[PDB]
Write a protein that binds this ligand. Sequence first.
Ligand SMILES: Cc1ncc(COP(=O)(O)O)c(CN)c1O
Ligand SMILES: Cc1ncc(COP(=O)(O)O)c(CN)c1O
Lengths: 362, 369
Amino acid sequence: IPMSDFVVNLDHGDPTAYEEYWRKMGDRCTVTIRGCDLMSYFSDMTNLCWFLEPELEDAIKDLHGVVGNAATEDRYIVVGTGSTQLCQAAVHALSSLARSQPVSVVAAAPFYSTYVEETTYVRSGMYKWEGDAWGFDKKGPYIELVTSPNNPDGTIRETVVDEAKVIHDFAYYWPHYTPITRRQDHDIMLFTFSKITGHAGSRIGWALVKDKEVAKKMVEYIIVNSIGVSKESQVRTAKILNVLKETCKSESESENFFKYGREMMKNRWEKLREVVKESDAFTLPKYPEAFCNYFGKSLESYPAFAWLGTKEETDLVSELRRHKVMSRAGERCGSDKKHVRVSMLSREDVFNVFLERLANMK
Amino acid sequence: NIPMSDFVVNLDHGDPTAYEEYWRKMGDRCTVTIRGCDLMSYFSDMTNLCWFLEPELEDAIKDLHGVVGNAATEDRYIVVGTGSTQLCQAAVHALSSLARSQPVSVVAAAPFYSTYVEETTYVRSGMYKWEGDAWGFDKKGPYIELVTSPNNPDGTIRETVVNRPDDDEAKVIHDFAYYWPHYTPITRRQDHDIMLFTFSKITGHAGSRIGWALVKDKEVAKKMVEYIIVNSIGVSKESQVRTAKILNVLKETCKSESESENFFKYGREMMKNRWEKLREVVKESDAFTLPKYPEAFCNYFGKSLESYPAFAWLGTKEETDLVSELRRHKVMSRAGERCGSDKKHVRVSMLSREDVFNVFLERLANMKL
Ligand SMILES: Cc1ncc(COP(=O)(O)O)c(CN)c1O
Ligand SMILES: Cc1ncc(COP(=O)(O)O)c(CN)c1O
């Protein structure tokens, strides 16, 4: 079997890039759970989010503290089974408190394809996905989704359209990906564990929510949806997240996660960048340089996804399938046939194989 | 310093803390160890229809049913979900999806599991409508029937009740969350189209958030899976690995003839002890009723024996709101009106800690007196 017939799967952003890193960290990352632990449905009935584990709460807030990307004071924390359940909890919670329904849900194009799935699959009478925000005019209550750094195109975003409301999805707003220009302080701020460290099968995200009443409804949603979130997932995320925090007080460019992650993304993007340059069809986006409060230097953005473009009237997702490279169709993301989103967080060898095949075609 | 007369006894939720002592005394053999680089990927197994299902856990489920003998696992799919809670919704969603017209009606024989009302109501879906009590139901069209046996709240063994053909557009979901030897005799190896189980209610590990569905129709199975994908991109990996570990111990325990090692013996002995106690109180009390449960032959234990369900369905001949009366004694339970019954019953959980159970018995004897 040649590495011409091997399918390189860069459609999903399964973040496996980070595995060797975590392997190396050895015995301190380990989580030990005994037969009788984590048995109860409840964590703490004193918290608005009663199914959130204290060690995890502390870890989340400590971590936004050391990095300085989001405000965690005077606001409620809600955990979900990935940020996926969290964005839907928020949409359901904000829809519940709107004067009237359906509430229009929009996001600037190109947007995170999954959003169209999340807002469409249960055929709920509470909210209606209304496509691109730029092209959104419609009256009545709406919710805007703002992914920054964006998915697919990695751009830094702000809103674009008075009681209607907004959700900020800052899943990729970490120092290894983009500079920390500012400590965010918005009404609803969504984060995901999978994207910081690569632990995607842990299924953990969190929401920082200012409005007390929105936090309450997100919670109710989750309780009816899954009665909360895996305790052991939460205890594990805590340990890894704590280790990541101890890692920040290190000079080692192989211990310090954010200086490990960032170098890797730089190395990966500089490589992809050669390939694209010495090629006649392709186009990557241009990323402004910006000062980083965390790193204390002025540096470039290296997004988890490459928005791969074509200048010629090709149907770019299909061409890549033909060379055994799965990508995410641009049409899926409110773009056009000339664009693909390719994951930049795969393993070394897969990424290389991907570059190799990107060179070896017309 | 707070008198025990101020202690609230919460028998409303069914938090199964009864089983902690047992798992503690099992010690290290139960421990689960997970290293920094484990379980990182979204995917478990791209071969399986449910690609987010950990093989260690598929094996455990299949093994456990193999041994207990309560459900058929052959020639069908296994869909893991975050609790049985996510799985029933996935099922109603899947069967509705595959229906000739929507909304599909969703009914359940009363008394029924209250949380069903919220689960098929909270997102105001176009695909299905909650139609309440299945008894005498004949709204013409596609319908799903929920059959929970042993039932919640009343412990009853159940079969479908709306049994018009409505041909092939009559669908059924079986919730066998309490069909285990420590609660009820295993009279038949269940072989229905959709069978749900929850890890919570076997061993008490409720915060693990683990249930599974045994699904015959692939088209339904694939739809449950797609619902879970969008809903939550699968189920916590470490939850799955930890559920498999303890399930496996549970299984090892089954050959043990020690009354205190063997889960189902211990489990059963605990339930019995508690129902005997509660039954004494209701007997000597003046105003209380309790359901009668037939004796039946258990294929697992090989003996004819009683059910001791996880919930007590407490009633009153008297004309009072029983949920209110218990509320005045700092005993919380689940309103019978919430389960499609009347003010004269409430559901109380038999699965609390030993001390809490006892304070409730103490209080129960002191009632109306
Ligand atoms: C914009 C965006 N939102 C959310 C998700 C992550 O959701 P989860 O943590 O539920 O996997 C991703 C990919 N990890 C994403 O790119
Ligand atoms: C009938 C019934 N079904 C399902 C649930 C189990 O749900 P979960 O998977 O959320 O523990 C329960 C609570 N044990 C129940 O009583």
